Amino acid sequence: KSEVLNTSRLKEMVNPGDVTARELNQKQESFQMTATMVAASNYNFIIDTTDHGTWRRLRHYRSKVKFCHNPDPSNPYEKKEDPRFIHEYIMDPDCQNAFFSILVYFWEKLQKEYNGQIKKVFCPTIESETEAYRKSQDT
């Protein structure tokens, strides 16, 4: 179902400061937030606010390709599913090792160029689509 963002309980999820919370059966604790966050849904989200403080963060994207059992023509974005990607090809240790190698290589690439900050690589597709998204959700 479509999910509504509170515009709260989200600044702590994104701002690189500190945040406190309490666990069952003991006291309250505070800790840094060293996390990379990602979310997805087939239903559009809800952003009630419009202020720059909330829209400075966040990066929206819209996937174009689609997989169906029958690769219907006249649609390059339409292709056929591979059930071997889900039933297997994930628990295979060699695939995981290769993915780890790809990830570490991409980390090194991001380290050497664009300095270390991620708000330096230009992706006009992502900025344009995020601008279009911000034009929507604006009652």
Binding site: K1, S2, Y43, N44, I46
Partner: protein, 56 residues
């Protein structure tokens, strides 16, 4: 959706359609909230889309 379209559906702001659907669901088929938001897109996924004006 198709059941209601067949039974009772004969700028298309969709307010009348949304209220008909929500009331219908909350009656003929159980009782529950009917957030719309994308319910317009769901209706435009049905047969009523052909005889529908997407623009308000």
């Amino acid at each position: 959706l198709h059941r209601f379209i067949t039974e009772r559906v004969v700028v298309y702001n969709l307010s009348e359609v949304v209220t008909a659907y929500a009331e219908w669901y909350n009656t003929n088929i159980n009782v529950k909230r009917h957030i719309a938001l994308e319910l317009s897109q769901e209706l435009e996924n049905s047969v009523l889309e052909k005889y529908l004006q997407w623009s308000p």
